[PDB]
Design a protein around this motif. Sequence first.
Motif, short mmCIF file in Angstrom:
data_model
loop_
_atom_site.label_atom_id
_atom_site.label_comp_id
_atom_site.label_asym_id
_atom_site.label_seq_id
_atom_site.Cartn_x
_atom_site.Cartn_y
_atom_site.Cartn_z
N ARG A 255 0.82 -1.20 0.00
CA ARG A 255 0.00 0.00 0.00
C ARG A 255 0.86 1.26 0.00
N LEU A 256 0.28 2.33 -0.52
CA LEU A 256 0.90 3.64 -0.48
C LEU A 256 0.23 4.47 0.62
N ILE A 257 1.04 5.25 1.33
CA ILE A 257 0.59 6.15 2.39
C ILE A 257 1.00 7.55 2.02
N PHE A 258 0.08 8.50 2.21
CA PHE A 258 0.39 9.91 1.98
C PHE A 258 -0.03 10.67 3.21
N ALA A 259 0.89 11.41 3.82
CA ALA A 259 0.60 12.23 4.98
C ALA A 259 -0.27 11.45 5.97
N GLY B 224 -9.05 2.46 -7.02
CA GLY B 224 -10.22 3.08 -7.63
C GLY B 224 -10.24 4.58 -7.45
N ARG B 225 -9.05 5.16 -7.28
CA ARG B 225 -8.89 6.57 -7.01
C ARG B 225 -7.65 7.05 -7.72
N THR B 226 -7.58 8.35 -7.96
CA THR B 226 -6.39 8.96 -8.59
C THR B 226 -5.62 9.81 -7.58
N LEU B 227 -4.41 10.21 -7.95
CA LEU B 227 -3.65 11.10 -7.13
C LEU B 227 -4.41 12.40 -6.83
N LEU C 36 5.32 9.93 -1.03
CA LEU C 36 4.49 8.77 -0.65
C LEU C 36 5.40 7.73 -0.04
N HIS C 37 4.84 6.92 0.85
CA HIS C 37 5.56 5.83 1.47
C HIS C 37 4.93 4.49 1.10
#
Length: 81
Positions: free
Chosen positions: A50-54, A61-64, A75-76
């Motif tokens: 998985r990617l984590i942001f803040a 099913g989502r975009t940046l 991103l982590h």
Amino acid sequence: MQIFVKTLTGKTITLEVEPSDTIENVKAKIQDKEGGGGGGGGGIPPDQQRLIFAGKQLEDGRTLSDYNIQKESTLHLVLRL
């Protein structure tokens, strides 16, 4: 635009992305950047990552742009085993 990713091995890489890029498209771009050593087959599958942001886990099913991730964001990558 450029964003940065901290990978599972602790490296930092730069990706070229568009705000409309999906979370799995971004994950796939990360894999592409890490495949010039091992040689043959060897890696952890997208669905175990998985990617984590803040502090927030990004979902598929989502975009940046849906998370308002803009240029020079970091991103982590984490494991979800």
